Design an enzyme around this catalytic site. Structure first.
Site, PDB file in Angstrom:
ATOM      1  N   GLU A 250     -74.437 -42.068 -13.377  1.00 27.64           N
ATOM      2  CA  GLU A 250     -74.050 -41.163 -13.106  1.00 27.64           C
ATOM      3  C   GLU A 250     -72.511 -42.834 -12.527  1.00 27.64           C
ATOM      4  O   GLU A 250     -73.120 -43.123 -11.706  1.00 27.64           O
ATOM      5  CB  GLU A 250     -73.656 -40.535 -12.303  1.00 27.64           C
ATOM      6  CG  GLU A 250     -74.196 -40.589 -11.232  1.00 27.64           C
ATOM      7  CD  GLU A 250     -74.159 -39.360 -10.171  1.00 27.64           C
ATOM      8  OE1 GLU A 250     -73.951 -38.292 -10.303  1.00 27.64           O
ATOM      9  OE2 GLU A 250     -75.049 -38.731  -8.706  1.00 27.64           O
TER      10      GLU A 250
ATOM     11  N   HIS B  94     -73.822 -34.963  -6.451  1.00 21.23           N
ATOM     12  CA  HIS B  94     -74.482 -35.886  -5.951  1.00 21.23           C
ATOM     13  C   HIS B  94     -73.507 -36.757  -4.609  1.00 21.23           C
ATOM     14  O   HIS B  94     -72.925 -37.150  -4.942  1.00 21.23           O
ATOM     15  CB  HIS B  94     -74.908 -36.569  -6.934  1.00 21.23           C
ATOM     16  CG  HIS B  94     -75.867 -36.179  -7.557  1.00 21.23           C
ATOM     17  ND1 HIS B  94     -76.107 -36.292  -9.267  1.00 21.23           N
ATOM     18  CD2 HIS B  94     -76.888 -35.377  -7.222  1.00 21.23           C
ATOM     19  CE1 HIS B  94     -77.234 -36.223  -9.458  1.00 21.23           C
ATOM     20  NE2 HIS B  94     -77.573 -35.099  -8.965  1.00 21.23           N
TER      21      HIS B  94
ATOM     22  N   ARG C  36     -71.978 -50.962 -24.005  1.00 20.24           N
ATOM     23  CA  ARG C  36     -71.649 -50.871 -24.815  1.00 20.24           C
ATOM     24  C   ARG C  36     -72.062 -52.260 -25.044  1.00 20.24           C
ATOM     25  O   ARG C  36     -73.050 -52.432 -26.137  1.00 20.24           O
ATOM     26  CB  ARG C  36     -70.922 -50.107 -24.881  1.00 20.24           C
ATOM     27  CG  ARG C  36     -70.915 -49.209 -26.430  1.00 20.24           C
ATOM     28  CD  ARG C  36     -69.980 -48.300 -26.461  1.00 20.24           C
ATOM     29  NE  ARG C  36     -69.657 -47.181 -25.685  1.00 20.24           N
ATOM     30  CZ  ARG C  36     -69.286 -46.193 -25.876  1.00 20.24           C
ATOM     31  NH1 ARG C  36     -69.816 -45.778 -26.554  1.00 20.24           N
ATOM     32  NH2 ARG C  36     -69.358 -44.986 -24.894  1.00 20.24           N
TER      33      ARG C  36
ATOM     34  N   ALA D  86     -73.227 -54.680 -23.491  1.00 25.77           N
ATOM     35  CA  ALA D  86     -74.585 -55.106 -22.712  1.00 25.77           C
ATOM     36  C   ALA D  86     -75.769 -55.604 -24.080  1.00 25.77           C
ATOM     37  O   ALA D  86     -77.091 -56.011 -24.625  1.00 25.77           O
ATOM     38  CB  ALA D  86     -74.916 -55.002 -21.590  1.00 25.77           C
ATOM     39  N   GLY D  87     -74.929 -54.352 -25.110  1.00 24.94           N
ATOM     40  CA  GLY D  87     -76.864 -54.348 -25.945  1.00 24.94           C
ATOM     41  C   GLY D  87     -77.047 -53.185 -26.192  1.00 24.94           C
ATOM     42  O   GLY D  87     -78.437 -52.724 -27.084  1.00 24.94           O
TER      43      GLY D  87
ATOM     44  N   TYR E  32     -77.860 -48.475 -26.573  1.00 28.80           N
ATOM     45  CA  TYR E  32     -77.579 -47.592 -27.742  1.00 28.80           C
ATOM     46  C   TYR E  32     -76.764 -47.028 -26.375  1.00 28.80           C
ATOM     47  O   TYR E  32     -77.536 -45.939 -25.950  1.00 28.80           O
ATOM     48  CB  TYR E  32     -78.728 -47.231 -28.363  1.00 28.80           C
ATOM     49  CG  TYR E  32     -79.569 -48.723 -29.187  1.00 28.80           C
ATOM     50  CD1 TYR E  32     -80.043 -49.253 -28.537  1.00 28.80           C
ATOM     51  CD2 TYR E  32     -79.107 -48.116 -30.404  1.00 28.80           C
ATOM     52  CE1 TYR E  32     -80.966 -50.135 -29.077  1.00 28.80           C
ATOM     53  CE2 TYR E  32     -79.860 -49.955 -30.904  1.00 28.80           C
ATOM     54  CZ  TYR E  32     -80.687 -50.251 -30.853  1.00 28.80           C
ATOM     55  OH  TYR E  32     -81.070 -51.788 -31.132  1.00 28.80           O
ATOM     56  N   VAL E  33     -76.008 -46.694 -27.242  1.00 26.08           N
ATOM     57  CA  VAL E  33     -75.037 -45.769 -26.047  1.00 26.08           C
ATOM     58  C   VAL E  33     -73.833 -44.609 -27.035  1.00 26.08           C
ATOM     59  O   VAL E  33     -73.211 -44.904 -28.065  1.00 26.08           O
ATOM     60  CB  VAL E  33     -73.500 -46.536 -25.510  1.00 26.08           C
ATOM     61  CG1 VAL E  33     -72.892 -45.314 -24.133  1.00 26.08           C
ATOM     62  CG2 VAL E  33     -74.645 -47.508 -24.509  1.00 26.08           C
ATOM     63  N   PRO E  34     -74.555 -43.270 -26.856  1.00 28.61           N
ATOM     64  CA  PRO E  34     -73.722 -41.906 -27.073  1.00 28.61           C
ATOM     65  C   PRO E  34     -71.606 -41.561 -27.224  1.00 28.61           C
ATOM     66  O   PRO E  34     -71.959 -42.806 -25.988  1.00 28.61           O
ATOM     67  CB  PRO E  34     -74.346 -41.173 -26.898  1.00 28.61           C
ATOM     68  CG  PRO E  34     -74.958 -41.462 -25.694  1.00 28.61           C
ATOM     69  CD  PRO E  34     -75.415 -43.228 -25.598  1.00 28.61           C
TER      70      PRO E  34
END
Ligand SMILES: CC(C)(COP(=O)(O)OP(=O)(O)OC[C@H]1O[C@@H](n2cnc3c(N)ncnc32)[C@H](O)[C@@H]1OP(=O)(O)O)[C@@H](O)C(=O)NCCC(=O)NCCS
Ligand SMILES: CC(C)(COP(=O)(O)OP(=O)(O)OC[C@H]1O[C@@H](n2cnc3c(N)ncnc32)[C@H](O)[C@@H]1OP(=O)(O)O)[C@@H](O)C(=O)NCCC(=O)NCCS
Lengths: 616, 616, 78
Positions: free
Chosen positions: B230, B272, B292, B294-295, B297-299
């Protein structure tokens, strides 16, 4: 009106305290969406009062009467009695209900009622234009309106057989269990039963199958009749004759069980009292053949009963006699807690732990040992206390010591606090138990408490290493008399027998008497001051009890401290002194003693002044 | 191994009496087919002892310690502490557990722990090679091996998310609730989690996300890493740097929440404590972009998280990195009773009925009337007795009469049976309650019971129509003194004031005094024999109480007879005389009175002879 | 049943009790005393057992009680 046995306004009495049957009736009323319960009152010959049951999830109260005339007078609207009296009481109770002007129907559940009694009930019923269903039946029911006791079993079965709504079928059987199977058969092969009745399996029933068949013939709601008979007797021949005389115009499905009989010995008496073909006419074959010839719809065997039902219903559907109605809302009642728990559907935490006894099994257990083993081994009262209080199988010297202490402390005359209070309560005309507790409630720090204090004080001194002289000295500095030390009359030259009996036993039989040897060193010092500063009875018990526990070997220092702390020793005194307390209470009762009032001259009245009671 | 946090042999302490959390941990151990419970002991700062919980359907005992060092010394095998202390106690208790040589992991549940305290815990943990999960977390879990407290909720949820057996996914989040949603997401899009950890939402956690990611990288069982971060703080930049430095070779799914922030005001602090982007680098956009690049897997959004997990899992299957598991047996635990009852799944019959008071609701009710209404209306003690005993809202004269009787019977000096027994029990050093009951237990037919007898005998005579002369005559013939008639000193010329006060009040204020009018006719006859045969206090109470009930009008003849039979009048005497009994007991305590022994000369000892005690 | 009946037989076997004496024994509740004395053992046992276990205060479960308050009309005097 005459053809209707039960409707949605039927009110009943349940004779006999059959809580499950009562609940079953109420559950049916609930799922049928009835305005009121079908039960006005319960007749319980042992007791008048109230009975609580469920109305769905809501709890309701039903009144409970000792007699049939008292219930009938309170609830004249109730015209049905569900009679759960045994075969020994079924006649007298049915006859009494039939003599009541407000009762019209009696269902006799009992099996094993004499044939003569049933004939007298049947004739009484016919003479008074009343109905007797049974004996030896579950009863019957009007779908969506009323059920007799246990008729049609569980609410799941009522739902599965769609019995919460009426159909077009008028059903009658001899068998109760087969009435329930028939409800299932019929619901699957038609719109279900409108009404169903089991007349019972007795040779002489209260009402014959034809009585009910004739009511179905008059009822406009019923378009189809179905019956299931059995071998023995000539009941089914009343139907065949009525079928021949055109008295039954509605289509009738009929099957007579007992086709096995000719293959087996002629001597075989079947389940139901009336299920024995005496003549050829009484056989299932002669009955099924006469039924076929009369114009009834008769299947090949019991296997194709439902199919014949399906065939006759379909014929009524084609002709339009019966119309296809919409399935009403499927009703719902929560599962009973006891069923959910028994099946393991739910888990319920326990509130209490019990480690000393168990009455749940085949046999009562005291600390895991069967009671028969406790008594066969002659463990005695001391052994039983060892198990229940210390969770120990004590050695013989320890169990006998416990029993010796109980005898020694049993009584010390009527003048002591406990005996004195028990006597006063007894003189006030109180019962034994109240008087006993009045006496026991004096047991504490000054009456009986020196036992614990002596165990406590002597154990600490001897543990912490204090020399007897140092203990005597320390107690004197604090201004505390040593608990367990001192007597009013007894001395070194004149000893207390209670003490000597206890000490002589421990010296002779205890494996170890370390705290007693220390105690006797302390006593030599106290008696060197005043001769009456002897080790008294209370001191002797507390100290020897620590020695007994140290001799057992199974108790740690901590365990022993816990025993002193929890007041096990006050319990031993209480148990033993109960004997003399009960003795004194009974003694005053035998003597016819009067109410006690303390003498006025034994009281110094010292009232505060007017000034002393002021707030400022 | 160093990378393993928990396994199937992990033993833990639960700090704080969290019975539901304790049950949740045990339930998981059971469904995972664990040999032993994951809990060695409970640490309860208020109390040492035992705690009972379930192991499936079987109840087990867990030991309970007051302190962390005492538990650690008893159970050195326990290397995990689940800390449920509040935010006001979390630091001191975690620090104490970390100082224990046997504890390696502490999970801090508390929300609202100061950032300095968390920094000091994290540094203490790193210095001692220990792990702190939290603060402000549910914890985490190793699927099929161990769960931290409430992690993954209900057993239904554990079963539905197949958490009873491990998968190949190593999961880490900040959010506790999202850890549970992630468990569901991952189980639906892969073979499920092997292990999952929530580090909490605080700005300075005990352990960073990377600490857990590094453990997953070393673990051979884990082939896939998934994380959910977050906005706010630079924790995720430790991961991106490790991803860039080739420290994380396993495929990593990553999503950072808080994409809403730039659209809303910069002042918005999210749920939080650490969820607030101070700089642009701290935003969800800057984090997801750096992930993204850095390699990882980002949705596209959180909606596509599962889809990304499905894509990475499928890639491991193609390359044969992940092997197909066969689904083990689906475990089963029965529903908790309280859940089944609360949902209406079951219905449970009550054992008791209560018609006089109800403490279940928003407010305490006395006979259906709210307590605040009883007191706002000044119903008084008499009114309260009216509600609780007679289930009536009594008129003012009736409630005042009850209060007058209580004052009149409060005490009659120390010499009477009840006071005498309470004084003896008090002199024996007994507490107030024991001493009170010792005295109350004398109340019956001779002390206090002439009240109930005077009501019974006078009511019957006057009802059955007996003329006062006939009643006086009948009683004399039977040899029965009239209850409520007679006094030792008081007479017609010298009356008892207690009587006079009661009769005068009834004469002046009762609507009707029919039974009193009769009793006074009886009294004229008895005083015509002996002047001291006056209507005494006990007679006065019994008779006037029947008149009070007849004056109320709401009681039938039967209801009144029930009141006399059930001994309501003995209760009124007991209540009022407890005042003087308690008074006497306290008086002996103030005086420092000694143990009583009845004088020996006041007892005639009449022992039976040796011959008299023989059995024939 | 067994205790009450055998206790009458014990007294008839002793021979020193008349029919009246035996009736008095039943009437005065000697037999309630014998039960009280014996059952004290298990009562003391259970009290001590709860003390060893460190048992908490009992409160009867709320769902085991049917609260049936009378109405405002039912509590009126007339
Ligand atoms: C002096 C006298 C009054 C002392 O009274 P007493 O009856 O002997 O004894 P006490 O009441 O003082 O008690 C004796 C001791 O026993 C102790 N004691 C009493 N009960 C005890 C108990 N249960 N546990 C332990 N110690 C106990 C007391 O503490 C006291 O100890 P101490 O002597 O070390 O102080 C008495 O002995 C006496 O009258 N003597 C005659 C003197 C005389 O003849 N004078 C000349 C006249 S011309
Ligand atoms: C004769 C004497 C002994 C009678 O004793 P007493 O004290 O008057 O009274 P009792 O004990 O008989 O009781 C009086 C009545 O009250 C009745 N009574 C007592 N308690 C009662 C109660 N609670 N409720 C109702 N009735 C009660 C008694 O049943 C008795 O009834 P009765 O007279 O119809 O039989 C006494 O009066 C006396 O000594 N008189 C002197 C005689 C005399 O001077 N003789 C010449 C000497 S030279």
């Amino acid at each position: 009106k005459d053809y209707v046995l039960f409707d949605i306004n039927t009110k009943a009495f349940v004779y006999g305290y059959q809580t499950n049957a009562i609940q079953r009736m109420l559950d049916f009323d609930y799922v049928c969406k009835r305005s009121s319960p079908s039960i006005s009152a319960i007749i319980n010959p042992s007791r008048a009062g109230i009975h609580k049951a469920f109305w769905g999830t809501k709890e309701i109260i039903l009144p409970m009467y000792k007699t049939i005339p008292l219930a009938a007078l309170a609830y004249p609207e109730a015209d049905v009695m569900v009679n759960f009296a045994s075969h020994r009481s079924a006649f007298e109770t049915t006859m009494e209900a039939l003599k009541e002007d407000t009762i019209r129907i009696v269902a006799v559940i009992a099996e094993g009622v004499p044939e003569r009694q049933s004939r007298v009930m049947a004739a009484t019923a016919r003479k008074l234009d009343k109905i007797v269903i049974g004996p030896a039946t579950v009863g019957g029911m009007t779908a969506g309106a009323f059920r007799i006791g246990n008729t049609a079993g569980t609410i799941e079965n009522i739902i599965a057989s769609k019995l919460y709504r009426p159909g077009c079928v008028g059903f009658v059987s001899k068998s109760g269990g087969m009435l329930n199977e028939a409800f299932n058969i019929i619901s699957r092969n038609s719109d279900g039963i409108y009404e169903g009745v089991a007349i019972g399996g007795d040779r002489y029933p209260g009402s014959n199958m034809l009585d009910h068949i004739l009511r179905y013939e008059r009822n406009p709601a019923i378009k189809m009749i179905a019956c299931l008979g059995e071998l023995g007797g000539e009941d089914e021949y009343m139907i065949i004759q009525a079928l021949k005389e055109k008295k039954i115009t509605k289509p009738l499905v009929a099957w007579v069980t007992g086709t096995c009989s000719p293959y087996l010995p002629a001597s075989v008496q079947f389940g139901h009292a009336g299920a024995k073909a005496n003549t050829e006419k009484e056989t299932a074959q002669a009955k099924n053949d006469a039924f076929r010839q009369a114009g009834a719809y008769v299947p090949r065997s019991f296997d194709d009963y439902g199919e014949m039902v399906r065939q006759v219903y379909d014929m009524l559907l084609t002709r339009g006699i019966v119309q296809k109605f919409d399935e009403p809302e499927v009703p719902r009642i929560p599962t009973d807690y006891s069923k959910a728990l028994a099946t393991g559907d739910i888990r319920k935490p326990t509130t209490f732990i019990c480690t000393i006894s168990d009455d749940s099994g085949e046999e009562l257990l005291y600390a895991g040992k069967k009671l028969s083993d406790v008594l066969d081994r002659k463990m005695g009262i001391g052994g039983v206390i060892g198990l229940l209080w210390f969770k120990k199988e004590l050695p013989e010297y320890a169990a006998h010591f416990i029993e010796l202490v109980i005898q020694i402390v049993a009584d010390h005359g009527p003048a002591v606090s406990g005996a004195h209070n028990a006597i006063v309560a007894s003189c006030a005309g109180k019962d034994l138990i109240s008087s006993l507790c009045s006496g026991l409630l004096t047991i504490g720090p000054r009456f009986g408490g020196a036992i614990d204090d002596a165990a406590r004080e002597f154990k600490r001194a001897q543990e912490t290493g204090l020399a007897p002289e140092q203990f005597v000295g320390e107690m004197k500095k604090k201004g505390i008399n040593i608990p367990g030390i001192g007597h009013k009359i007894k001395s070194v030259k004149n000893p207390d027998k209670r003490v000597q009996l206890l000490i002589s036993y421990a010296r002779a039989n205890f494996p170890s008497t370390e705290l007693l040897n220390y105690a006797l060193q302390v006593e030599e010092l106290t008696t060197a001051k005043k001769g009456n500063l002897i080790l008294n009875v209370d001191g002797c018990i507390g100290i020897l009890f620590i020695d007994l526990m140290s001799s057992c070997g199974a108790f740690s220092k901590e365990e022993i401290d816990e025993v002193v702390r929890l007041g096990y020793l006050n319990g031993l005194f209480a148990l033993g002194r109960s004997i003399g307390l009960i003795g004194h209470i009974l003694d005053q009762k035998r003597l016819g003693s009067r109410l006690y009032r303390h003498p006025a001259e034994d009281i110094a009245y010292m009232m505060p002044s007017e000034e002393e009671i002021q707030c400022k």
